[PDB]
Amino acid sequence: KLKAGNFDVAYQNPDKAIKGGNLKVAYQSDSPMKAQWLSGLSNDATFATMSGPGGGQDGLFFTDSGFKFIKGGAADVALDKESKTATITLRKDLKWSDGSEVTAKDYEFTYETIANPAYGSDRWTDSLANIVGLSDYHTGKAKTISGITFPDGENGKVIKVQFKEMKPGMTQSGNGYFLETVAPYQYLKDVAPKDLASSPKTTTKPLVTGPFKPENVVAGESIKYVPNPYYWGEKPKLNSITYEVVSTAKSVAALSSSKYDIINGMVSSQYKQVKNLKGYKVLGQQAMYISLMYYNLGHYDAKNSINVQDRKTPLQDQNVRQAIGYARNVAEVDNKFSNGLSTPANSLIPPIFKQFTSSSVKGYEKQDLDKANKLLDEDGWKLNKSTGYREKDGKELSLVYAARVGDANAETIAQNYIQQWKKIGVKVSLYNGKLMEFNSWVDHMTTPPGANDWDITDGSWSLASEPSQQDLFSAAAPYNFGHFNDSEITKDLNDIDSAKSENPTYRKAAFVKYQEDMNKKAYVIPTNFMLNYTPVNKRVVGMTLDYGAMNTWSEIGVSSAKL
């Protein structure tokens, strides 16, 4: 029995919030915190979440619950179809936490932190190539970005962005075609680009725009947030918020002891323990999330920003990629371990995207060992009965699986897949014989040109809030970890965001074709959709998961003091 969104998104607390209070929040992470306050230089969900009280890496725009931009946040955005432009207007009273002004240059500077390769960002995308002049800036052909202009100068509040083509997602946060954050140029301008990611000024001592500012950061561990007096909006109720990492093994005990009021990111396997805690209300919602299995198919040319699908491997054969997908027992694993919160995915577009997900698309959600065996046969991988593995030209079908650390069942689940692959005559071993630590895995995946010492890996994403996956899979994106490059897929991705896709009927058809083609080519295999849950101590007032709730850090409080 899969649980449905029949969780509550809000804890509607009838007790009044006090003036002051010290809220304690944790993110479940077995890896150390990676503090990076600049959105362009940060790749991980853990810190993006922990940065929330500080403004979420200085996000600019408010949205509704469907992620559509609305007016009244730190900035407004207006589109003009026929000029092919966006105009971003920063609030007159938008300030940094040192009291300095947020200006137009701070918005343009975000684009430089990603597009100028001297900063070492991993967030270049083909989506950004759609801004006039930005590709030429990115390659060093131009020293400025011609498509970004300032109607009232660099120290004004207005920025105009010129596009090559408009994209249907532009009405929605997470679209990727224009950026949504500011970076404090006056604070950071003297830091050499290569040094910016490791500077105290982007790690332990940042400037921020949110309702709280990080008074202290303990590297790898925690943030002490206090109210930011220069915040333009609603003054917070709380005196402080501490935000800390907590290990998977210590999470449940930290709720029993009231150490944390809220823990974010808790694994499906712990839900049975958490649901029984009388001092807590458990909130939940469909996760803006996908997990997937990647195949290593090439390398990344960083100088020229292109994934090159040139790796010599049996995984270049579609039948082999498909077989390895069909062999997994994802449903069996989810049924045993996930407490009904993980559902085997049929495609890469998760159910939260209700219009553009396709429930009738068939993927690898059902194990089919017979089909897997047939595919390998027909591709010439014949079973050596003496060994129980398949061969070609005396070469064994042997692969390396870079499985990751996780919860108490991670090694068991990885081994369960290795055993399923043995049933289809594929020999699979763990990378260096053990599960990979997360921060190490991220480095291994993102560092150009890519490694050649793995074949299969698992990734999972806190997805951008607009369903287009250009920024996961486009030919120029370092986030395409397996480095596939396929003209059919590139056309599919582009068609989803075409002018014709301003019509939602046409865009739906485009999303369906993309979902089908990705499953057929099998460069990646969708793994799981999830429901997320969040325990909240009963003393917390004004907590809600509603995606349309824009002022929660200012509104949230406590009804009694912590012991």
Binding site: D30, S31, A45, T46, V267, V405, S460, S462, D471
Partner: peptide, 9 residues
């Protein structure tokens, strides 16, 4: 979220 971010699980 406003961007794609890598999750530990």
């Amino acid at each position: 979220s406003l961007s794609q971010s890598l999750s530990q699980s």
